[PDB]
Every structure is written in C-alpha cells, then in structure tokens.
C-alpha cells in the first residue's frame, strides 16, 4: 500500500490570506501511462467529497481560480491563493496510481480570527429527567475561539474523570467561533448524595480559569 | 451535468448483510466505472473498491474482498454494492464515485455521490427523550437523548428562530445510544416574556417532539 501524508493537519488561515498544503507519498505516484494521479478533494461540513485538483495541477472544470496544484512524483502541494470562509473544511489527497488508492489523513482549514474567550453556562437536570433515574449535568462554552479548550468537573470540590463526554461545534461561518457542551451523567442516586456541581473552564481567552457552579 | 444518486439510509443489526446503490446520470454509465469509498465516524476516506461498468471487472482493498461484492446493471445505470457480515465499525457514510472504464487510466473519482449512511449496532431504533436545558444575555437549550440511529433535527419556535443556536453533534453513549443537546442564546430580558420551544424530529423512528423550555 502506498502511504499519504498530509502536513498540517490543521490548518487555521486569516480571513482573505493564502494558505499551502502539503501532501507526501511512500512511492513515486507516476502511471504506466505516463500521469501522475495525485488528486485533491475537498469535504466542505455536512457535504460529499469534490474534487477540486487532478492530476497535481488540472483544475477540475467547476473550480475556483484561487486552488492550484504543482509536485514532483512524491511531493505535493495545493495552494488556495486567498482564503474563503466558504473554504472552511477537510481537504484530502489521494493516490489514484496503484490500487487500493489511499487518502492522506485530512487537513482541516478553518478561519484564523482574533481569540475570543467562551461565555460559560451550566444547567442542571430537568425535574423531568431526574424521575426517569439519571442525571445530566451540561456546561456549555459558547462562541469561542480557538478551538482548544479544557472543561473540568468538580461534585463537591471532587474532580471527575471518566464520567463526562465532549462535543464541538463546526465552525461557525460568520464569527469564526466554536461552541462546546460537555455533559455529566450521574445516577439519580449519585446526583442527589451532593451538593455543589461546577464546571471549570480554561482557555487562552480568559486570564484564570472560569467556574460555573450551582447548588442543589 | 453528471450526478450520482444513492439509496437511503440503512439500520442493521450487526452480521446482517445489506445492498446499497447508486444510480448514474448525465452520461454512458457503461463507458465508466464506480468506485466506492466510506467514512466512519471522526475518521477520514478510505477506499473500498472498484467495478467496470463497461467489462465487469473488480477490484477491491483486500480487508473487505470477503464481504464485498460489487455488480451493475447497464439497463438501469446503476452500480451496487453487497456487504456481507456487517460489524459495527461498518458503521459509515458509503459514497460512490464515478471512476474509471479500465486501467489505461489511474483514478477519476471526479463525481460523488451524496452518500448513504450505514449504522450497524446491536441497539434498537427508538425517539429520544426530550429535557429542558432551562435558562444581560442567557442561555437555554433541549438536551436530546437516549435515541438511535442518527440522525435527528432540531428546530426553535417551528423555524422562527435561527439566531444564536448551536446544535451539538451527536455523541454514542455507552448505551450504544446517541445524545446531543441544542442550545440557544436570549436576552435575560425574553426570559419571562416570550415563549422557547424546541423541536425534535427524528426520522428513523417516526417520532416527533415538541418541548416547552422554561425558565
């Protein structure tokens, strides 16, 4: 098999400036009929693959004239000369020159924008859920920016671990941010046994960490 | 143009077997072949394999040569795939691609189509259950959980409101149930004023639940 290896696999650009990405393969990707089947996908969100590049270099007919491609037999590059926000997404190589073909691992683009620290929000189970025997705590981290961000549970000043699971937003195409929940699922028996739930938020926007907190 | 269209989306329990298709448009189906690529959950392409609709020649990656078989039929322009044995990281978007006639040329892969979504688990279809994420600016939302397969909707106010809400993507849970929340954020001054509810469809199970968000 030939490997494909991307670099980097994230990739944040300002608003309107060019961006590079590199794509490496583990044989020369030359075809007996004298081609090199390099090709550039890209996975906008929520949306099947499209090819934007061919060939190392061919646009595909539908394609801005911002994407270009040039390589050697092993070493790869697509140019997006001016960053769209509507260029938002996961871009793959493939090699299309011995079967099984094989992608790169996937380069995620993303708007660069200026840090945005979260507004930090916790709820406490609905009286509804807490009868049905469960319980779920969420902390919400709104309109952030970067990505990377650290959510810690603390039941009565304990930290938690291994109770609790994460998820982020897409990016959103107009503020540039991201927004994260992270949930605590309890028994209706271990939630009601505390009393102070708070989520401990930490990021590059805020100079201390922030804590979000109520009382049963 | 040229389009590719794929059947809807399947639910099985794991070991069954399952046929997906993708009908071409647009162009000789049978000058062409159709290559098949899937996406697991948080994870890249990865190829599947490959059919001549012009010689009926196959190829596939050797992982799936055992429970994979791929034919067409020229008198409709549509390629199908077969999986046998489904395991639960089965679990994929499918796409079809259009792809070369024969090996005098490498990959084209040059149309795609939409996809086709495959979940393969051992839980049930069932509508999730619905709880309030109860609220100068506030936050609210509905915390959706307990459901399978993905995916569901959600909507605030019948579509009215747009502005501000985020809707998580779906995690599995151990339970091997997915659960997400959707949250918007108001002014603390439409709190006690105007009225939030929350939407959910889930169209795998036929459900549909409308929640009332208070403060």
């Known amino acids: 098999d030939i490997v494909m290896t991307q670099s980097p696999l994230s990739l944040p650009v300002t608003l309107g400036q060019p961006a590079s990405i590199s794509c490496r393969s583990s044989?020369?990707?030359?075809?007996?009929?004298?081609?090199?089947?390099l090709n550039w996908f890209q996975q906008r969100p929520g949306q099947s693959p499209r090819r934007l590049i061919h060939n190392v270099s061919n646009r595909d007919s539908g394609v801005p004239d911002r994407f270009s491609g040039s390589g050697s037999r092993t070493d790869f590059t697509l140019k997006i000369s001016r960053v769209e926000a509507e260029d938002v997404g996961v871009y793959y190589c493939?090699?299309?020159?011995?079967?099984?073909?094989?992608f790169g691992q996937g380069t995620k683009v993303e708007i660069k924008r200026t840090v945005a620290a979260p507004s930090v929000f916790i709820f406490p189970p609905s009286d509804e859920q807490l009868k049905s025997g469960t319980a779920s705590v969420v902390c919400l981290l709104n309109n952030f920016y970067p990505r990377e961000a650290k959510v810690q549970w603390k039941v009565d000043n304990a930290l938690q671990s291994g109770n609790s699971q994460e998820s982020v937003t897409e990016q959103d195409s107009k503020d540039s941010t991201y927004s994260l929940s992270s949930t605590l699922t309890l028994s209706k028996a271990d939630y009601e046994k505390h009393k102070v739930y708070a989520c401990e938020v930490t990021h590059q926007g805020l100079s201390s960490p922030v804590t979000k907190s109520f009382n049963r | 143009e040229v389009q590719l269209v794929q059947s809807g989306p399947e639910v099985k329990k794991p070991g069954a077997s399952i046929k997906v298709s993708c009908r071409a448009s647009?162009?000789?189906?049978?000058?062409?072949?159709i290559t098949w690529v899937r996406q697991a959950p948080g994870q890249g392409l990865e190829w599947m394999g490959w059919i001549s609709a012009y010689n009926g020649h196959t190829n596939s990656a050797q992982k799936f040569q055992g429970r994979v078989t791929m034919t067409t039929d020229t008198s409709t322009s549509t390629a199908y795939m077969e999986v046998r044995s489904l395991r639960s990281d089965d679990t994929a978007v499918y796409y079809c691609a259009r792809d070369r006639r024969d090996l005098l040329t490498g990959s084209l892969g040059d149309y795609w189509g939409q996809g086709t979504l495959v979940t393969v688990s051992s839980a049930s279809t069932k509508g999730p259950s619905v709880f309030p994420l109860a609220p100068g600016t506030a936050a609210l939302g509905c915390l959706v959980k307990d459901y399978f397969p993905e995916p569901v909707t959600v909507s605030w106010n019948s579509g009215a409101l747009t502005s501000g809400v985020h809707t998580f993507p779906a995690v599995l849970q151990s339970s091997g149930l997915y659960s997400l929340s959707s949250v918007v954020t108001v002014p603390s001054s439409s709190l006690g004023t105007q009225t939030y509810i929350c939407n959910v469809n889930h169209k795998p199970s036929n459900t549909k639940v409308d929640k009332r968000v208070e403060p």
């Open positions: 493939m090699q299309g020159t011995y079967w099984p073909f094989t």
């Open positions: 044989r020369g990707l030359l075809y007996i009929d004298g081609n090199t089947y």
């Open positions: 647009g162009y000789t189906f049978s000058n062409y072949g």
